[PDB]
A paper describes a structure:
One key enzyme class is the poly-β-1,6-linked N-acetyl-d-glucosamine (PNAG)-degrading glycoside hydrolases, of which the canonical member is [name] B (DspB) from CAZy family GH20. DispTs3, [name] and DispLp all consist of a single domain with the expected (β/α)8 (TIM)-barrel fold for GH20 catalytic domains. The β-strands in the centre form a tunnel atop of which the active site is located in a groove, presumably to allow long chains of PNAG to bind. GH20 enzymes use a substrate-assisted catalytic mechanism, also referred to as neighbouring-group participation (NGP), in which the reaction proceeds via the formation and subsequent breakdown of a neutral oxazoline intermediate.
DispLp showed very low activity against both substrates, while [name] showed the highest activity of the tested dispersins. In contrast, less than 1.3% of the sugars hydrolysed by [name] and DspB were monosaccharides, indicating a preference for acting in an endo manner. 6-Ac-Cas has micromolar affinity towards [name] and DispSf, with a Kd of 6 and 15 µM, respectively. In the active site of both enzymes 6-Ac-Cas was distorted into a 1S3 conformation, which is consistent with the proposed catalytic pathway of GH20 enzymes based upon the 1S3/4E (Michaelis complex/product) conformation for GH20 enzymes that was first observed for the S. marcescens chitobiase. The catalytic glutamate residues, Glu161 in [name] and Glu156 in DispLp, are 3.4 and 3.6 Å away from the anomeric carbon of 6-Ac-Cas, respectively, consistent with closer positioning to the glycosidic oxygen during catalysis. Glu161 and Asp160 of [name] are ∼5.2 Å apart, confirming that Glu161 is the general ‘glycosidic’ acid/base in catalysis. Arg13 of [name] (and likewise Arg17 from DispLp) forms two hydrogen bonds to the C3 and C4 hydroxyls of 6-Ac-Cas with distances of approximately 2.8 Å. Glu300 of [name] forms two hydrogen bonds to the C4 hydroxyl, at a distance of 2.7 Å, and to the C6 hydroxyl on the pyrrole ring, at a distance of 2.75 Å.
Residue numbers in the entry: 2 to 324
Write the structure that this text describes.
Amino acid sequence: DQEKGITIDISRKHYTVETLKSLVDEISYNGGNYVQLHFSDNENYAIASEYLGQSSENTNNTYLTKNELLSLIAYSNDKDILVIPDIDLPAHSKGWLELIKKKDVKLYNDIVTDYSEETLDYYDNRVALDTVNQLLDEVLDLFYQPKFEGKQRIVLGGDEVSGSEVHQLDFIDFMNQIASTVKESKYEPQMWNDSITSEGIANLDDSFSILYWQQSTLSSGEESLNVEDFENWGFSVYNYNAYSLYFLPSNGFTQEDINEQMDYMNWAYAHNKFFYISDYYHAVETSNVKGSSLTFWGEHATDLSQKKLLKQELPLIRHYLNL
Ligand SMILES: CC(=O)N[C@H]1CN2CC[C@H](O)[C@@H]2[C@@H](O)[C@@H]1O
């Protein structure tokens, strides 16, 4: 049984609760299993947070209200869709770090790396971990879904982490600590594949499942981890192929571009075709593949209305879910 899900970047682009419910409708209609809500990145923290100071119970341009988010989750569960929170750590963190800076600059200075305003200090910093863990505790409560008790998952990020290749055991220790936190709330942790190396794999909590979007290349020029490697160290993977299964909605696209994307998906997508350095659509014959996801990243969607976002995304959701 291979799962299929839709990942939605609501940090780079604003989505109303109605847009999101319409998208979930389409996921359910075509038998999709989950929706991954990527709500925390550099540009914005796009859900309500008592901890971070986003508490308005009024609809606004910056974050889903708590009531809106809970409504969305309940609507999803009623249609047998699991909602997977995605909070990106320790990089891709500028949006919530900027909120901490507002709340408490002393704390900000105690937890941000000295070189990157986008990156939480994962290099063995207890106050940084404690702060993260408080945020995670709020997120794990917010996304509680009793219908899926024992099956909940949370994406914890781990993509494009500066310093992670050199300082790999610190990165892995950090990821293991936040995995511990989510596992205490009976969530399965997940992370992207790209910043884990040969050096870290043996120390990484194999409770993690891996969102495998693009095989990395090490500073040596050597290939980084592939799906067989993950299998060999006890990790399950999901196919998030960066070419076949990424789409960036844009105001410059026409209907013809969406049709082309579907014709491209016809040949480029398969459940087990992963993005490897040698082959962008590499078929893997391992036993550790659990599913796939189409992801809508938000950074090109600047001038799109909500109606136009639906116009581009609905057909792509349907086409992917029926392939
Ligand atoms: C896991 C991942 O894809 N990470 C980044 C890189 N990808 C590549 C395609 C997008 O730019 C997207 C970007 O929005 C994401 O933040």
